[PDB]
Amino acid sequence: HYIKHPLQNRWALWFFKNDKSKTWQANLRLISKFDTVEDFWALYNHIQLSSNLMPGCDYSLFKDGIEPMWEDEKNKRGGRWLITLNKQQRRSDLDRFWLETLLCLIGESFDDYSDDVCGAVVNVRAKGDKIAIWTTECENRDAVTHIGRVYKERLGLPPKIVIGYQSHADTATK
């Protein structure tokens, strides 16, 4: 006897399996979709912590209909607010920051500019784990700025962890 609380958006959780035989897109896999708070927690409570993913693997949470790749119409001209962690920060902060990121997404924490958010991505990597929020238009400087500011506040980033914005066009070049 419970009424679930609906989210503004329906979301999809993706997993990326590091298989070097296969193409990047072919390693991408849909786990599940949800559109209530309680379904979010039901999913979260039955998946692995990011810090325990195999090296080279990712989680992505994206709005329904947006694939977690540069090529998607909604990401093409977009970009990301990115933080990179070192090795001790995997243990102490990765899982905390990822969950905080997820709550920013589903809770629509960026006011009107929440419509500019496409999703978020966590990359578990030997060289240093990465968390990012993907936004739809790198040129919407107001949206980008506000999202970045609020996101940095909600994460509670210490100054030793810098947060930076880059367009996917530049990433896909380098």
Binding site: Y2, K4, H5, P6, L7, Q8, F15, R29, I31, S32, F34, V37, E38, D39, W41, A42, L43, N45, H46, I47, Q48, N52, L53, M54, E100, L103, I106, G107, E108, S109, D112, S114, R154
Partner: protein, 35 residues
């Protein structure tokens, strides 16, 4: 108008009884999911 939730409320919902059952068609991905 937009449905917005702050952190404290989202966290309180985690205790709900509906969050203790996995999603119905959760796939089997050993090490990643617990269906």
């Amino acid at each position: 108008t937009r449905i917005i939730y702050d952190r404290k409320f989202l966290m309180e919902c985690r205790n709900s009884p509906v969050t203790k059952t996995p999603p119905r068609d959760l796939p089997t991905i050993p090490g990643v999911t617990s269906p």
